[PDB]
C-alpha cells in the first residue's frame, strides 16, 4: 500500500538559496544553495531546520527557485520577467513576516496558480533594517493574464485586505515603476 511508505513528490523540485551581505566577496559568490528537495516531507525538514526570516540580521535573504532557476535578474528565465512585491515595514516583520513567507513558499510548491505556475520562478524574502520584502518573481512581465492571475491569487492567500494594493515590477525596469497593480 504505498500511502504510508511513499513520499509525496512535488510537482517540481526546488531549491532553497541564502544570502547574506559579507563585504570581502563578491555579490555572486556570497550565494549560497541550501539544499534542494521534491517532496512534501523533504520540503517540511528543510523548513523545520533553518531560522525564520524574523530571526535573520538585516541584509540576509532567502530565495526559493525551481531547480535550475537562479535567484537573479542574468538568469535566461529571470530577465524578461518580474516580481510581485510585498513591502512590510518595521513592525511587520513582528506580525506577518514569517507567516506571509510560509505562505509563499507553500503557494510555489504547491502550485497555487493553475496553469499559470509555469510563469512562476521562485520567491525572494529580503530581511532589511528599512523594511522586509517579500516577492513572487515570474517569467515574462508582459505576460498579463499569467501575471495577473499570479497576483491576485497570491493577495487572497496573504489575506490581504482588498483596500490595500500590491504591485508588479519587470526585473528590467527594477535595474535602472509599476507594470500591474492588484
Known sequence: NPEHYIKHPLQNRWALWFFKNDKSKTWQANLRLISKFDTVE???????????????????DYSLFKDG???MWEDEKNKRGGRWLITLN????????????????????????????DDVCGAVVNVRAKGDKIAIWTTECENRDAVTHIGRVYKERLGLPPKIVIGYQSHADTATKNRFVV
Do not use: V
Not at 531546520?49 to 538585516?58: A, V
Open 69 to 71: 532557476i537562479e535567484p
Open 90 to 117: 518595521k513592525q511587520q516583520r513582528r506580525s506577518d513576516l514569517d507567516r506571509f513567507w510560509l505562505e509563499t513558499l507553500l503557494c510555489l510548491i504547491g502550485e497555487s496558480f493553475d496553469d499559470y505556475s
Open 42 to 60: 523533504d520540503f517540511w525538514a528543510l523548513y523545520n531546520h533553518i531560522q525564520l526570516s524574523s530571526n535573520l540580521m538585516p541584509g540576509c
